[PDB]
Design a binder for these strands. Structure first.
Ligand SMILES: N[C@H]1CCN(c2cc3c(cc2F)n2ccnc2c(=O)n3C2CC2)C1
Ligand SMILES: N[C@H]1CCN(c2cc3c(cc2F)n2ccnc2c(=O)n3C2CC2)C1
Ligand SMILES: N[C@H]1CCN(c2cc3c(cc2F)n2ccnc2c(=O)n3C2CC2)C1
Ligand SMILES: [Mn+2]
Ligand SMILES: [Mn+2]
Lengths: 481, 150, 482, 156
DNA sequence: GAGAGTATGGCCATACTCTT
DNA sequence: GAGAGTATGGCCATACTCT
């Protein structure tokens, strides 16, 4: 009736640490989602809150997710949902929000009561085919509901949107990427498994941040892709504008990813006040919806704006590094992965998802065909079928008699009994036959995909291409020589 | 007579039972320096509640309670809070554990607190080594332990 | 000018707010006894299928549903309202069943919505009974996406049963809770004789019955309130003088007044002994537990009179408190001061109308089904021709026309024939259809009788009210002295 | 707060609920005190009232100075609902009782139901001193019965 | 003297890891 | 540094009417 202190520490610590690793802070390699995000997305899908339908109150979404899947504080769920809605945070946003969802100035979103939201068109591609036995479903925390273990993820979300989680023992930091480039790299890899990271880089030039900006050099990126770890220099887009009377100004149009605009300004202001930087006369933020980011710094008449701008990179978050640390959950264990490993795992998820969907469609097609064969028999001998039923006292009797007489199965006999009298008309008779003929052709197509692995691989390629064409966009971040 | 009892509770007996609610995660004293520790309001509330004092000024005789019970949620975060609280006890009020005044409640309340387990410390050396490894500043030690038990 | 007059803005803005707080926030409806927020919580539970049989659901999900769907206001307003409906000391007949800390008499509120869970009570089902049988009118919600009930069927008299307490603009309302047995009895008495006096109704309804029990001093206050709709009722705590050996004494308080904060009362008495306002007390204790209920013990000084001291406490502290009755309810969607008889008359009419509407709905359904069955009966009698008629037809539109023209049947009947499953052709199924039709004909007659004769309809209301009284009615908790 | 002339300067009072140099924002959380019902000590202790006084920096009552005005335009921007209206009435009561001259100077505006982007605000103008004094007392005053009467006559 | 009950949402700290 | 992002919720004020 006593507990050892060393025994409690070891047991309790491990319980928490493992939980934070495998079910809180780290994303899955296949769908790029931490548990809270997956649940928010699935909850939107289950409540039917798609792009076509209207925005739903945030308190309803959060409350649904909490009650059904996520047994944690409402503020955790809401804040996660907010970030997925932010264009500066997510390269390809997964939530479409209405109202104040925050800004670049660090301003938080207004309380759940004053906001509303629904899923984005791209999120549908994460959920595509979920109901065709493509992924595994597990029970939720209470046992009352069932939830997806992973999402089908028809586009490579882990690299596309990136990840940033602090666990125990470890942490993760994956930058966002351009979708066009990624898919191209994926197609390149699928064609040739022996492709080098150098060769992959011809397709994927580097990270592409939603906030645009510039990456200084390829050197840091290459280490990152090859080893899974690396430091990448991010610098703001600034121009030195020349004015009347030799006066000058610096204009900032893009800032680094995850950098708070307001705090950066306050940092510069602190330098001018404390006389740690010399030359600046005035600092203004002319950021608007029309102009995007616009930060103007007016230089003194004597000052060399080139000198000041270079000082600012060295002294403020106008230049910041991103430290890549690519840990994702691979086979439900944390693993440091390089670029190729990430692409290999995602490709396999696609191959498996497509195979499983094809197997599901086949089971359905064959079931229906079997049923149709029975219905075809019934329509050819309708007069006898009708008399067989009428002569029977109960439905159990008719079932047995229909099976024994017309060499039908139990499922086929059931279907005949369930037939509506309207099926006996000309069009309906022809419809049944035409469905059967088409179904036979379709079963062959499905059978081909399952027999030859190259056909299945081509199908994955074809579907990825469609996604690239529909959702892929231009590179925003410039990589400088 | 202290011969009364206090309950530390994470989430939501008048004569003899005392209740002290702890909102949020407690500070990790193994990672923090003394000035920070003593300035933490939740830590200060606990010191005051017992009144024994910390470190060298500890007086076992001047204890307000002979039963101190850590009653935390039956989830993973409950465990984490439990580890954090034990760290504070081990580092700042070690003799309390030696005096067997600290308890851990088993199953978030009337029917529960009832089962209480006594916290007992057998090895001074092992515990010191364990605490530094699990709660310490060095990340790499923690990672290795996870690896080997994962 | 692009200018607004200050007096014109004041008058318009003020009126907008005042009217809204009156007809859609603070005042209850006379028929169901509910303010809009409460109605929405109850209906939201019903629509989400959260009933007494099923498990408790998280409060954040209930609140979020009500907020998104019906109540465009802060989450804290909805939650706090839901909490009160779950409190046994607040509601005489509670409408919500809660799990976790839902507060107590000491003023301490319920734990945050994240830590609490809830579902409807068995009695709440009787408020919602027959809602889907066109008994009440449904209106659009704030955004137009949903529909909600304008009022609930309310098969028990909820306004008087649970009471009301709302502060509006221009007015306020304060209705005390009542015993359900007594109410229904009064309702039955009134239905029997429309010209019944308030004196006569009081033979059934003795007075208010508070969930916190206690004692009402005299019937004089109650009479004024019931006759005029306004008056003051004296409520005093149940306290007994307990004797110990050698003349040692103590006062024990087992019940306190309605809506009186127990903690605050204790602190006030403590303030009186500290300030030397009252002399003769050695110790004040609260021993209240879930087992014992309310227990407040005051030990009296030796050779001090307990009777005298106890009487001072009534005069000085909330140990005795008055309830000021102010019976304003929404009648025809406008505020009105009503007496006891008017409240009972309006509720009775709601029941009469609800039952009429339910009966009319059932009849329309019964007749529809019968009409369908008559067609199916025709088809089964002439199946061979029916089958040939369909098979000869190229499209479903053709078969429909041909079935109508040939067997002298209606479009609805022809549709039903086409939708018929082949399994309906068996012996059992043929007999089943006939047996349904025979029973249906008998039922239509029963429904028609109720709608023709007004006494039959009135009896049905009586009968249903009696059933509710027997199932839910309980003992009177509050004692009326003298 | 605002990014020199008060003429160009405009301040917005908001009931909590993007795209603005002179423009200033002061958010008012909760219901504002009814100054018609309250005595001076209570009034001056109200945090929301104190924030507003300081914002304008003209002083109140006797010490009120039109010249001291920090902003030439004061806009009451409240929610488009019933409570918005109530807050609107409460704010106007404060202006009428403590800074009457501002309304006379036409510095106060009411924004009607994207509106902030200049790419409507209505002027509050005071036509009759006597009528307003009568109206304020009736609507915001301590006597309940007068308020009831107004509702009854104008209802629905 | 108060306080009965629906309405109108910020502000606070900590764990955990990584870094020109 | 400090802050990137999921986790663990109590404390504050006012309107409005009525004895
Ligand atoms: N004196 C400190 C200790 C706890 N606390 C606190 C608690 C918060 C928060 C923010 C907080 F500052 N906070 C911020 C967002 N969500 C929460 C939240 O859920 N909590 C509760 C669970 C502990 C104030
Ligand atoms: N401790 C409780 C006991 C009654 N009380 C009270 C009563 C008031 C008032 C103001 C009050 F605070 N109050 C304020 C204005 N008018 C009244 C008023 O008429 N009364 C009623 C009893 C006579 C507070
Ligand atoms: N100016 C700050 C200090 C006073 N205030 C406040 C606001 C509350 C509350 C409780 C409050 F104290 N409060 C308590 C419960 N719900 C609420 C609530 O919704 N609100 C918000 C809408 C006004 C806002
Ligand atoms: Mn917990
Ligand atoms: Mn509003």
């Amino acid at each position: 009736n006593e507990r050892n202190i060393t025994s409690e520490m070891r047991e309790s610590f491990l319980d928490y640490a493992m939980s934070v690793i495998v079910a809180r802070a780290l994303p899955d390699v296949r769908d790029g989602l931490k548990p809270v995000h997956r649940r928010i997305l699935y909850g939107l899908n289950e409540q039917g809150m798609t792009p076509d339908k209207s925005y739903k109150k945030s308190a309803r979404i959060v409350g649904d997710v909490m009650g059904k899947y996520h047994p944690h504080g409402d503020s955790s769920i809401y804040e996660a949902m907010v970030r997925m809605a932010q264009d500066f945070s997510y390269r390809y946003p997964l939530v479409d929000g209405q109202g104040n969802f925050g800004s670049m100035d660090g301003d938080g979103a207004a309380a759940m009561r004053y906001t509303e939201a629904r899923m984005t068109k791209i999120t549908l591609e994460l959920l595509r085919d979920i109901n065709k036995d493509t992924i595994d479903f597990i029970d939720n925390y209470d046992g009352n509901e069932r939830e997806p273990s992973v999402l089908p993820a028809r586009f490579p979300n882990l690299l596309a949107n990136g990840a940033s989680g602090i666990a125990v023992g470890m942490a993760t930091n994956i930058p966002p990427h351009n979708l066009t480039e990624l898919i191209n790299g994926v197609l390149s890899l699928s064609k040739n498994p022996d492709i080098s990271i150098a060769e992959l880089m011809e397709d994927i030039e580097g990270p592409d941040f939603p906030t645009a900006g510039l990456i200084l050099g390829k050197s840091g990126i290459r280490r990152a892709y090859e080893t899974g770890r690396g430091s990448i220099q991010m610098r703001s887009r600034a121009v030195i504008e020349e004015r009347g009377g030799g006066r000058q100004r610096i204009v900032v149009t893009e800032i680094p990813f995850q950098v708070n605009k307001a705090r950066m300004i306050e940092k510069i202001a602190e330098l001018v006040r404390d006389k740690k930087i010399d030359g600046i006369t005035d600092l203004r933020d002319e950021t608007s919806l029309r102009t995007g980011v616009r930060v103007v710094i007016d230089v003194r008449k004597d000052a060399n704006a080139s000198v000041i701008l270079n000082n600012l990179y060295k002294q403020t978050p106008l230049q910041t590094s991103f430290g890549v640390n690519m840990i994702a959950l691979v086979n439900g264990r944390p693993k440091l992965i390089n670029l190729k490993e990430a692409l290999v795992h995602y490709l396999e998820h696609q191959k498996t998802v497509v195979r499983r969907r094809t197997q599901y469609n086949l089971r359905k097609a064959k079931d229906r065909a079997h049923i149709l064969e029975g219905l075809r028999i019934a329509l050819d001998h309708i007069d006898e079928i009708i008399s067989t039923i009428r002569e029977s006292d109960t439905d159990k009797v008719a079932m047995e008699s229909l099976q024994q007489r017309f060499k039908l199965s139990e499922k086929q006999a059931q279907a005949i009994l369930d037939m509506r009298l309207r099926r006996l008309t000309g069009l309906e008779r022809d419809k049944i036959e035409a469905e059967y003929n088409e179904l036979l052709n379709y079963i062959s197509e499905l059978e081909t995909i399952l027999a030859d692995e190259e056909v299945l691989l081509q199908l994955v390629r074809d579907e990825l291409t469609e996604i690239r064409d529909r959702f892929g966009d231009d590179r925003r971040t410039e990589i400088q020589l | 007579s202290p011969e009364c009892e206090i309950f530390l509770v994470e989430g939501d007996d008048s004569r003899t039972q005392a209740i002290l609610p702890l909102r949020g995660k407690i500070l990790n004293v193994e990672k923090a320096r003394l000035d920070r520790i003593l300035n933490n309001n939740e830590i200060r509330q606990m010191i005051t509640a017992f009144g024994t004092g910390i470190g060298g000024d500890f007086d076992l005789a001047k204890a307000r309670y002979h039963k101190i019970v850590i009653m935390t949620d039956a989830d993973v975060d409950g465990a984490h809070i439990r580890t954090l609280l034990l760290t504070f006890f081990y580092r700042f009020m070690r003799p309390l554990i030696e005096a067997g005044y600290v308890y851990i409640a088993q199953p978030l309340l009337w029917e529960t607190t009832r089962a209480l387990l006594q916290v007992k410390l057998e090895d001074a050396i092992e515990a010191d080594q364990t605490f530094e490894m699990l709660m310490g500043d060095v990340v790499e030690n923690r990672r290795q332990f996870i690896e080997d038990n994962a």
